Design a protein around this ligand. Structure first.
Ligand code: CLA
Ligand code: CLA
Ligand code: CLA
Ligand code: CLA
Ligand code: CLA
Ligand code: CLA
Ligand code: CLA
Ligand code: CLA
Ligand code: CLA
Ligand SMILES: CCCCCCCCCCCCCCCC(=O)OC[C@H](COP(=O)(O)OC[C@@H](O)CO)OC(=O)CCCCCCCCCCCCCCC
Lengths: 73, 721, 40, 151, 66, 146
C-alpha cells in the first residue's frame, strides 16, 4: 500500500508537470492525506452525481463497494 | 493488589500490574461484607464530587483570569468565546488566535459564556468568587469521605432505608434546588439580563444585591413587585404574570428561551417535586411502604410479580447501578435533543460551534452510560442472582423464554437492516446506472414520513387552540412561518421532514435495536446456555471456555458489552452526523436585509443524503477541507488531533485482529536477547490477557474514532460559523 | 516517616522523573530554540 | 426519630452537642444583656466604625479567646491542663471552684433553670436575629410598634 | 385591606377547610367513615390542616384553570 | 532520660513515641511525624541545629541597623570563594554526620533561642515583601496606632 501510494503520487504529479507539489507535501503525513488522497478523489466520487452520471460511475460504485467488503471483514 | 492481601502478595509476572488497576474499584470482589462495600462506594461518591467540584472551580477561575468574557458580553454577536491561554513555547503560540476583544486565546465550545450571561454574571470579580467557593466545597467533599470511612461510617441499615432517601432526593435536592434557583432568576438573572438586552453595558449595570435589597430598582420594570404585601397572600396570582409568562418560543433579540418562562418553570418544578416528595413511609405515620405497593401488582401473565424486588434492590448495588445508568444515560440523550430545539441560553443558538459540540457531547455520554447498564445488569445475574433466597418471578419467565426474546430481536434487526441500509444501496445503484426516477427520493418514488409531519403540524396549531395560555410555539422547529435571527445568524427555523429524513430515522431504529440485541443477549445468557450450561461458574469477565464445541469465544457477558460497545459507537456516530448535516443544510446560515436565507451547505441534504456516495462526498470529503487545511492557523491542533486519532484508531486493530499466543512467543525471543546481556527483569514479561487485549482494543478504537470526529466537527463549525 | 518516602518511590517516581526531564528539556529549548543542529 | 443516637460517635448522635447546648446557654445570655447594655444606657440621655478596623480586634478576640477557650477543651478531653496557679479539679461539665471566689452552690438544679434561662435567651437572642434582619428595623422598634398596632 | 383582607385571608385559610371535607368522613362513633378515614386515609388531621394549605392553593389555582 | 513532665507545646496531652525529651528542647512537637525514623530524626536534628546557628547570626544583622538608624567585586568571586570555603567547611561537617548533665541545659536553651531567630529572621521579610517598609523603627513606631 505504501509502495503503490508512493509510486502513483510521484507520477501523477510528474504527469501534470508539477513535481513541486510532491517534493513539499510528501515530507509530512497531512500532505499525503490531503494532496494525494483528498485531492484526487473529486472526479472519482462524482462518477455519479445527484445531477448527472459519468463514465467514472463504475469506479465510484466500486470505490464504495471496496469500502463495504473491507468493513465487513 | 493493594485491596486484597493474597492479591497484594508478590509480583512474579507483569500481569499482576494490569490486574491491580482492573479490579481497583471492584469492591464486591474484595469482600463479601455488604456493609463494607456500601461504606466504600458511599465515600467514593464524595471523592468524585470533589473532583467535579474542583473541575468547576477551574472553569470559573479560567473564565475570570484567562478569558475575554467581559469583552464578549458587550459584543456577543461577533466575539468568539475563548478561555485558557497557551504559553509561547516550542512554537505553541500559534494556537492563540483572533477571537475578538483584543485577546489571544483558543475558542471554546463548553458554553460557559452563555451560561454566565444567563446567570447575570458581569465581572471577573464575580467569577473569581465562584471559583473559590467551588474550591472550598471541593475541600469539604474530599474531607467528608475521609470522615465517613475512618471516623463515622454509616450502618448497612442506614443505606437500606430507601423510602427516606427517595423522599429527600426528589424533594430536598430537586424541589428546593429548583426553587432556590427560581429565586436567583427573578431577583438577579431576570433583572440584570433585562438590562443587558437593552445594551446598558455590564459596568453600567447595578450590582445584583442592589436589586434584592430595595424593590425600587426591580419594580420599575415588572411592576408586580411594587406591592410590598404582594398578591401572593391574596392568592389571586394574576398580578405576578409580568415577570413570569407562558410565552414560550424564543426571544428575537437574545435567541434564547425567555427567562420569563424558566423562572415560572422552576417555580412549578420545585413544588411539584416538593409534593411528590411526600410519598413514602418513614416514622411519623403518613406515607407509603414501597415494599407493600410493589407486592400489590401481580398478573394473570406475571403470576406473582415484583414480589421480592424490594429485597433485591436493597442488597445489590449492581442492580441499582444498572437501572440508574440506563436512565441517566437516557436522560443525557433527551437533554441533547431538548437544548438544540429549545435554546435556553442567551446567544446560544447563534453560537453554532457550541451547539454542535454540546449536542454531540451529550449523545456520547448518554450512549456510554446506557452500555454500562448492560454490564452491571449482567454482573447482577452472575454475582447476585439467587433464586433460593430472593426469587422475583418476573426475572423468571424472562429467563424462561429468553431464547424467544433474542430470536425475535434477531429478526427485527435483519428486517430493519434491510429496510434501512438496503434502500441506500438501491439509490446508490439506480443513480450510478443513470436512473434517478427509480430511487427512493422526493423527486421520484417518495416515502414521506407523514406521521412525524402530522405530529409537527398539531404542535404548530397548538397555541390558541389546545394551548390557550401559550402565545407562541414550544420550539420554532414546530413554528410554521416564524424565523428568529440573532445577529446576522439564524438562531432557529422550522425543520422540514422528507424522504431523506425517513431513511435516517430508520437507521437509528436499527442501530439501537442491534445494540440492544447484543447487550440483552449477554445479560440473559450470562449464567446458562445450551452451549455452556455453567457459564455463571466461569464468572462475568472470562475470555472463553476453550476451542471446544466448535469454538466458544466471547461467550462471556463482558464480551457482549465489548461487542455492543463498538455498536454504540456505530450508532451515535451516525446520529451526530445526522445532526451536523441537517442543521448545516436546512437550518444554520446567514439572513440578509431582504430576508433571504442562505444555508451553509445550501439544502443539499434532501437529495444527497439518500445516497451513500452522497455522505462520503457532500458530507465527509466536503466538510473535511477545514480540518485538513488548518495547518498554519489557530485551528492547528485540530488538524493534528485529526491525524492523531486516525492513528490510535488503526492502532486498535492490532489488538482486535490478533491473539496473545503470537505475542507471548515473540517475547520469548526478546527475553533471550535480554538474558544474553544480563538485562532480564525478575518480573517476567507476559503478554496481555485474552480479555485485556479486547479491553485495550475497544478503548483505542473508541478513542481514535470519537476523537477523530471531535477534530472533525470542531474544525468545521469554527471556520464556518 | 519511612512511609512517605516509599510512597514516593513507586510509578509516581516515573511522573516526577518525567516532569523533571520535561522541565529540563523545555528550559533547554527556551535558551536554545529552533535547534536543527549542534554547531560548536 | 431525631433524638435516638446509637453512634461511636462522630458527634451528631452521642452526648455532647447537647453539651455545647448547655454552654451557649451562657453567652447567648452574656451576649444578650451585654448587647442591650449599650442600647438603653443611652436611652437616658450599615457599616459603622469604631477603632482601626475591628478585624484587628478580632485577631485579639480570637487570640486571647484562643488561649482561653482552648484549654477549656483540654480539661474535657482530659481532666488536667497544668500550665501557669491554674487549678481545675472540677468535673468537666462544670468547674466552679477557683473562678467563683467563695461560693460553690449547684444542685436545685439552678442548672436546670440556667439552661432554662439558657434556651429562652437562645430564642430571645434568636429573636434579635430574624427580627432586625428581614424587616430592616431593630428588635425594639417593631416590638414597640407591635404593641402599638397589634392587628 | 380591612375586613375584606381578613375575609380572603380566612378563605385562603378556608381554601384549607374544603379538603378537610375530603376526607371529613365523620360517622363518629357510627358508622365507620371516621374509623375508615382514620384507617388508611390518615396515619394527625392537622397534618391535614397542613395538607390543607398545600394542595388547597392548588385546587383554587386549578378550579380556575380546569 | 525519659519524662512525662516536659513542658509540652499543647498541654494534656502531647506524647509522640519518637520524641521523649531525651533531646534538648524537646517540647513534644511533631504531628506530622516529620521524622519517626531515627535516621529521620538524627538528620532533622542536625538540620534544625545548623539552621538556628545561622539564623542567630542573621539576627546579628538586625543588630546593625540600630547601631545606625556591598563588595569589591560583587557576587561572583565573593561566592565562589564562599562556595569553595563553606564547602570544605560544610564538607567535613557532612562526613561527621555519617561517621556532664549541665550541657543538656545549654543545648536545650541554645535551640530555643535559635528557634527564635528563624521565626524572627523569617518575620522581618514576609513583612518586608509586598510591604516596602523596614522593621528598624516599627517596635515603637507602629505602636503609635494599630
Ligand atoms: C487524608 C489522608 C488519607 C490517608 C493517609 C488515607 C489512608 C488510607 N486509606 Mg483513605 N480516603 C481518604 C484519605 C486518606 N486515606 C479520603 C479523603 C477519602 C474519600 C475519597 C478516602 C477513602 C478511602 C476508602 C474507600 C478506602 C481508603 C483506604 C485507605 C487505606 C489504604 C490506602 C488505599 O486505599 O490504597 C491506595 C492509595 C491511594 C492514594 C489510591 C489513589 C486514590 C486517589 C483518591 C486518586 C485521586 C484521584 C485522581 C486525581 C483521579 C485522576 C487521575 C488522572 C491523573 C488520570 C489507607 C490507610 C482503604 C482501606 O481502608 O483498606 C481496606 C479503603 O477501602 N480510603
Ligand atoms: C459493514 C460491515 C458489516 C455489515 C454489513 C454488518 C451486518 C450485520 N451485522 Mg455486523 N459487525 C461489524 C460489521 C458489519 N456488520 C463489525 C466490524 C463488528 C464488530 C463490532 C460487528 C459486530 C456485530 C454484532 C455483535 C452483530 C452484528 C450483526 C449484524 C447483522 C444485523 C442484521 C442485519 O442488518 O441484516 C441485514 C444485512 C445487511 C444490512 C447487509 C447488507 C445487505 C445487502 C445490501 C443486501 C443483500 C445483497 C444481495 C441480495 C446479495 C446477493 C448477491 C449475490 C451475488 C450473492 C447484519 C448482518 C448482528 C446480528 O447478528 O444480527 C442481529 C449482531 O448481533 N455485527
Ligand atoms: C455509574 C458509573 C459506574 C460505576 C460506579 C462503575 C463501577 C464499576 N465498574 Mg463499570 N461501567 C460503566 C459505569 C460505572 N461502573 C459504564 C457506563 C460502562 C460501559 C463502558 C462500564 C463497563 C464496565 C466493565 C466491562 C467492567 C466494569 C467494572 C466495574 C467495577 C470495577 C472496575 C474498576 O475498578 O474500574 C477499573 C479502571 C480502569 C481499568 C481504568 C481503565 C482506563 C480507562 C478505561 C481509559 C479511559 C480513557 C480516558 C477517559 C481518555 C484517555 C485518557 C488518556 C489518553 C490519558 C466497579 C464496580 C468491572 C467489573 O468487573 O465489575 C465489578 C468490569 O470489568 N464496568
Ligand atoms: C481541574 C481542572 C483544571 C484543568 C484541566 C486546568 C488546566 C490548566 N490550567 Mg488551571 N486551575 C484550576 C483547575 C484546572 N486547570 C483550579 C481549580 C485553579 C484555582 C486554584 C486553577 C488555577 C490556574 C492558574 C493560576 C493557572 C492555571 C493554568 C492552567 C493551564 C496550564 C497548565 C499548568 O498549570 O501548568 C503545570 C502545573 C504544575 C507544574 C503544577 C501541578 C492548563 C490549561 C495556567 C494558565 O492558564 O496558563 C496561562 C495558570 O497560570 N490554572
Ligand atoms: C434533602 C437534602 C439532601 C441533599 C441536598 C442531598 C444531596 C446529595 N446526596 Mg444525600 N441523602 C439525604 C438528603 C440529601 N442529599 C438523606 C436524608 C439521606 C438518608 C437516606 C441521604 C442519603 C444519600 C446517599 C447514600 C448518597 C447521597 C448522595 C447525595 C449527592 C448526590 C449528588 C447529586 O444528587 O447531585 C448534586 C450535588 C450537590 C448539589 C452538592 C450539594 C452540596 C452539599 C452536599 C449540600 C449540603 C446541604 C446544605 C446544608 C444545603 C448529593 C450531594 C450520594 C453521594 O454523592 O454520596 C456522598 C450518595 O451515595 N445521599
Ligand atoms: C392530548 C394532548 C394534550 C396535551 C399534551 C395537553 C397539554 C397541556 N394543556 Mg391541553 N387540551 C387538550 C389536549 C392536550 N393538552 C384538548 C384535546 C383540549 C380541548 C378540551 C385541551 C384544552 C386545554 C385548556 C383550556 C388548557 C390546556 C392547557 C395545557 C397545558 C397545561 C396542563 C395543566 O394545567 O396541567 C397538567 C399543557 C401543556 C392549559 C394551558 O393552555 O397552559 C397555559 C389550559 O388552560 N389544554
Ligand atoms: C497504526 C496501527 C499500528 C501500529 C502503530 C503498529 C505498530 C507496530 N506493530 Mg502492528 N499491526 C497492526 C497495526 C499497527 N501496528 C494491525 C492492524 C495488525 C494486524 C492484526 C498488526 C500486526 C502486527 C504483527 C504481527 C506485528 C506487529 C508489530 C508492530 C511493531 C513493529 C515495530 C515498529 O516498527 O515500530 C515500533 C513501535 C511503533 C512504531 C509504534 C509505537 C507507538 C508510539 C511511537 C510509542 C510512543 C508512545 C508515546 C510516548 C505516547 C504515549 C501515550 C501516553 C498515554 C503514555 C510496531 C509496534 C510487530 C512487533 O511486535 O515487532 C516487535 C509484529 O510482530 N503488528
Ligand atoms: C456583657 C459585657 C459587656 C459590658 C459590661 C459592656 C459595656 C459597655 N459597652 Mg459593650 N458589647 C458587648 C458586651 C458588653 N458591653 C458585646 C458582647 C457586644 C457585641 C454585640 C458589645 C458591643 C458594643 C458596642 C458597639 C458599644 C458598646 C459600648 C459599651 C459601653 C456603653 C457606652 C455607651 O455608649 O452607651 C451609653 C452611655 C453611657 C453608659 C455613658 C453614661 C454617662 C453617665 C450617664 C454620666 C454622664 C455624665 C458625663 C459622662 C460627664 C462626666 C461626669 C462624670 C463625673 C460622671 C459600656 C462600657 C459602647 C462603647 O463602646 O462606648 C464608646 C458602644 O458603642 N458595646
Ligand atoms: C582526586 C580527586 C579528588 C577530588 C575530586 C576530591 C574532592 C574532595 N575532597 Mg579530596 N583529596 C584528594 C583528592 C580528591 N579530592 C587526594 C589525592 C588527597 C590526599 C589523600 C585528598 C585529601 C582530602 C582531605 C583531607 C579532604 C579532602 C576533602 C574533599 C572534599 C572537599 C569539598 C570541598 O568543600 O571543597 C570545595 C567545595 C566546592 C568546590 C563545592 C571534596 C569532595 C575534604 C573533605 O573530606 O570534605 C568533607 C577533606 O578534608 N580531600
Ligand atoms: C398498526 C398501528 C397500531 C399499533 C399496534 C401495534 C404496535 C404496538 C405493538 C403491539 C405490542 C402489544 C403490547 C401489548 C401490551 C402488553 O405489553 O401487555 C402486557 C401484559 C400484561 O401482563 P399482566 O396483565 O400480568 O401485567 C401485570 C403484571 O404482569 C405485572 O405486575 O403482559 C404480557 O403481554 C406478557 C407478554 C409480553 C408481550 C410481548 C409483546 C411485546 C411487543 C414488542 C413491541 C414493542 C413496541 C413498542 C413500541 C413503542
Amino acid at each position: 500500500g505504501w509502495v503503490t501510494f508512493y509510486w502513483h503520487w510521484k507520477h501523477i504529479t510528474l504527469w501534470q508537470g508539477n513535481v513541486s507539489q510532491f517534493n513539499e507535501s510528501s515530507t509530512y503525513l497531512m500532505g499525503w492525506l490531503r494532496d494525494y488522497l483528498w485531492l484526487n478523489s473529486s472526479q472519482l466520487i462524482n462518477g455519479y452525481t445527484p445531477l448527472v452520471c459519468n463514465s467514472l460511475s463504475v469506479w465510484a460504485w466500486m470505490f464504495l463497494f471496496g469500502h463495504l467488503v473491507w468493513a465487513t471483514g | 493488589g493493594h485491596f486484597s492481601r493474597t492479591i497484594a502478595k508478590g509480583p512474579d509476572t507483569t500481569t499482576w500490574i494490569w490486574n491491580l488497576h482492573a479490579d481497583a474499584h471492584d469492591f464486591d470482589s474484595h469482600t463479601s461484607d455488604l456493609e463494607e462495600i456500601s461504606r466504600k462506594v458511599f465515600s467514593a461518591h464524595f471523592g468524585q464530587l470533589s473532583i467535579i467540584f474542583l473541575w468547576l472551580s477551574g472553569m470559573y477561575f479560567h473564565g475570570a483570569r484567562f478569558s475575554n468574557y467581559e469583552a464578549w458580553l458587550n459584543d456577543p454577536t461577533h466575539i468568539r468565546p475563548s478561555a485558557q491561554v497557551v504559553w509561547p513555547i516550542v512554537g505553541q503560540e500559534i494556537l492563540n488566535g483572533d477571537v475578538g476583544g483584543g485577546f489571544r486565546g483558543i475558542q471554546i465550545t463548553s458554553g460557559f459564556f452563555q451560561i454566565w450571561r444567563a446567570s447575570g454574571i458581569t465581572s471577573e470579580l464575580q467569577l473569581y468568587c465562584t471559583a473559590i467557593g467551588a474550591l472550598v466545597f471541593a475541600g469539604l467533599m474530599l474531607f467528608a469521605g475521609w470522615f465517613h470511612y475512618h471516623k463515622a461510617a454509616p450502618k448497612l441499615a442506614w443505606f437500606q432505608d430507601v423510602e427516606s432517601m427517595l423522599n429527600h432526593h426528589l424533594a430536598g435536592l430537586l424541589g428546593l434546588g429548583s426553587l432556590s434557583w427560581a429565586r436567583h432568576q427573578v431577583h438577579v438573572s431576570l433583572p440584570i439580563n433585562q438590562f443587558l438586552n437593552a445594551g446598558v453595558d455590564p459596568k453600567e449595570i447595578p450590582l445584583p444585591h442592589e436589586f434584592i435589597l430595595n424593590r425600587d430598582l426591580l419594580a420599575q420594570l415588572y411592576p408586580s413587585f411594587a406591592e410590598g404585601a404582594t398578591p401572593f397572600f391574596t392568592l389571586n396570582w394574576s398580578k405576578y404574570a409580568d415577570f413570569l409568562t407562558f410565552r414560550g418560543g424564543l426571544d428575537p433579540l437574545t435567541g434564547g428561551l425567555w427567562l420569563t418562562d424558566i423562572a415560572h418553570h422552576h417555580l412549578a418544578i420545585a413544588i411539584l417535586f416538593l409534593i411528590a416528595g411526600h410519598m413514602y413511609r418513614t416514622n411519623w405515620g403518613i406515607g407509603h411502604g414501597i415494599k407493600d405497593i410493589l407486592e400489590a401488582h401481580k398478573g394473570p401473565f406475571t403470576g406473582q410479580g415484583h414480589k421480592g424486588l424490594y429485597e433485591i434492590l436493597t442488597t445489590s448495588w449492581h442492580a441499582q447501578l444498572s437501572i440508574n445508568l440506563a436512565m441517566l444515560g437516557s436522560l443525557t440523550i433527551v437533554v441533547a435533543q431538548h437544548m438544540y430545539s429549545m435554546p435556553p441560553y442567551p446567544y446560544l443558538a447563534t453560537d453554532y460551534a457550541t451547539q454542535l459540540s454540546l449536542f454531540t457531547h451529550h449523545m456520547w455520554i448518554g450512549g456510554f452510560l446506557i452500555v454500562g447498564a448492560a454490564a452491571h445488569a449482567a454482573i447482577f445475574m452472575v454475582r447476585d442472582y439467587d433464586p433460593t433466597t430472593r426469587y422475583n418471578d418476573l426475572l423468571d419467565r424472562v429467563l424462561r423464554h429468553r431464547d424467544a426474546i433474542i430470536s425475535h430481536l434477531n429478526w427485527v434487526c435483519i428486517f430493519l437492516g434491510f429496510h434501512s441500509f438496503g434502500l441506500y444501496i438501491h439509490n446508490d445503484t439506480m443513480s450510478a446506472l443513470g436512473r434517478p426516477q427509480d430511487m427512493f427520493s422526493d423527486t421520484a418514488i417518495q416515502l414521506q414520513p407523514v406521521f412525524a409531519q402530522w405530529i409537527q403540524n398539531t404542535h404548530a396549531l397548538a397555541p390558541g387552540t389546545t394551548a390557550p395560555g401559550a402565545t407562541a410555539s414550544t420550539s420554532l422547529t414546530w413554528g410554521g412561518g416564524d424565523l428568529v435571527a440573532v445577529g446576522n445568524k439564524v438562531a432557529l427555523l422550522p425543520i422540514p421532514l422528507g424522504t431523506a429524513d425517513f431513511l435516517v430515522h430508520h437507521i437509528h431504529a436499527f442501530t439501537i435495536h442491534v445494540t440492544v440485541l447484543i447487550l440483552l443477549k449477554g445479560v440473559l445468557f450470562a449464567r446458562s446456555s445450551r452451549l455452556i450450561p455453567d457459564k455463571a461458574n466461569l464468572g462475568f469477565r472470562f475470555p472463553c471456555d476453550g476451542p471446544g464445541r466448535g469454538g466458544t469465544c466471547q461467550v462471556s457477558a463482558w464480551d457482549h458489552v465489548f461487542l455492543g460497545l463498538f455498536w454504540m459507537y456505530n450508532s451515535i456516530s451516525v446520529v451526530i452526523f445526522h445532526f451536523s448535516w441537517k442543521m448545516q443544510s436546512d437550518v444554520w446560515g446567514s439572513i440578509n436585509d431582504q430576508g433571504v436565507v442562505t444555508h451553509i451547505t445550501g439544502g443539499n441534504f434532501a437529495q444527497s443524503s439518500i445516497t451513500i456516495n452522497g455522505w462520503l462526498r457532500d458530507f465527509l470529503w466536503a466538510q473535511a477541507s477545514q480540518v485538513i487545511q488548518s495547518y498554519g492557523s489557530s485551528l492547528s491542533a485540530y488538524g493534528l488531533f485529526f491525524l492523531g486519532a486516525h492513528f490510535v484508531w488503526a492502532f486498535s486493530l492490532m489488538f482486535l485482529f490478533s491473539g496473545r499466543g503470537y505475542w507471548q512467543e515473540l517475547i520469548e525471543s526478546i527475553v533471550w536477547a535480554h538474558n544474553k546481556l544480563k538485562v532480564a527483569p525478575a518480573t517476567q514479561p507476559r503478554a496481555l490477557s485474552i480479555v485485556q487485549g479486547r479491553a485495550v482494543g475497544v478503548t483505542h478504537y473508541l478513542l481514535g474514532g470519537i476523537a477523530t470526529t471531535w477534530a472533525f466537527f470542531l474544525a468545521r463549525i469554527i471556520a464556518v460559523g | 516517616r519511612d512511609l512517605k518516602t516509599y510512597l514516593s518511590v513507586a510509578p509516581v517516581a516515573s511522573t516526577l522523573w518525567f516532569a523533571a526531564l520535561a522541565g529540563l528539556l523545555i528550559e533547554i529549548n527556551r535558551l536554545f530554540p529552533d535547534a536543527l543542529t549542534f554547531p560548536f | 426519630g431525631l433524638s435516638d443516637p446509637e453512634g461511636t460517635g462522630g458527634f451528631i448522635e452521642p452526648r455532647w452537642l447537647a453539651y455545647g447546648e448547655v454552654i451557649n446557654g451562657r453567652f447567648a445570655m452574656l451576649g444578650a444583656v451585654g448587647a442591650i447594655a449599650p442600647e438603653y444606657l443611652g436611652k437616658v440621655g450599615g457599616t459603622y466604625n469604631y477603632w482601626a478596623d475591628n478585624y484587628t480586634l478580632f485577631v485579639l478576640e480570637m487570640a486571647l479567646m484562643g488561649f482561653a477557650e482552648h484549654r477549656r477543651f483540654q480539661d474535657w478531653a482530659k481532666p488536667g491542663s497544668m500550665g501557669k496557679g491554674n487549678p481545675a479539679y472540677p468535673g468537666g461539665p462544670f468547674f466552679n471552684p477557683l473562678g467563683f471566689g467563695k461560693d460553690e452552690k449547684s444542685l436545685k438544679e439552678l442548672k436546670l433553670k440556667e439552661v432554662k434561662n439558657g434556651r429562652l435567651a437562645m430564642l430571645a437572642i434568636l429573636g434579635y436575629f430574624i427580627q432586625g434582619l428581614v424587616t430592616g428595623v431593630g428588635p425594639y422598634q417593631n416590638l414597640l410598634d407591635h404593641v402599638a398596632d397589634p392587628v | 385591606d380591612f375586613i375584606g383582607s381578613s375575609t380572603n385571608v380566612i378563605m385562603v385559610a378556608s381554601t384549607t377547610l374544603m379538603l378537610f371535607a375530603g376526607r371529613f368522613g365523620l360517622a363518629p362513633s357510627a358508622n365507620r367513615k371516621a374509623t375508615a378515614g382514620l384507617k388508611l386515609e390518615a396515619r394527625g388531621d392537622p397534618a391535614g390542616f397542613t395538607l390543607a394549605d398545600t394542595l388547597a392553593c392548588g385546587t383554587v389555582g386549578h378550579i380556575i384553570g380546569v | 532520660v525519659a519524662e512525662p513532665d516536659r513542658p509540652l507545646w499543647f498541654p494534656g496531652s502531647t506524647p509522640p513515641p519518637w520524641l521523649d525529651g531525651s533531646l534538648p528542647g524537646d517540647f513534644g512537637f511533631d504531628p506530622l511525624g516529620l521524622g519517626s525514623d531515627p535516621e529521620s530524626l538524627r538528620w532533622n536534628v542536625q538540620a534544625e541545629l545548623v539552621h538556628s546557628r545561622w539564623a542567630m547570626l542573621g539576627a546579628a544583622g538586625i543588630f546593625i541597623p540600630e547601631f545606625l538608624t556591598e563588595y569589591f567585586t560583587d557576587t561572583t568571586t565573593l561566592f565562589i570563594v564562599e562556595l569553595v570555603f563553606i564547602g570544605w567547611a560544610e564538607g567535613r561537617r557532612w562526613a561527621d554526620i555519617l561517621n556532664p548533665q549541665k550541657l543538656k541545659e545549654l543545648r536545650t536553651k541554645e535551640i530555643k533561642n535559635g528557634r527564635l531567630a528563624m521565626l524572627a529572621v523569617m518575620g522581618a521579610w514576609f513583612q518586608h515583601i509586598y510591604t516596602g517598609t523596614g522593621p528598624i523603627d516599627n517596635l515603637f513606631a507602629h505602636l503609635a496606632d494599630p
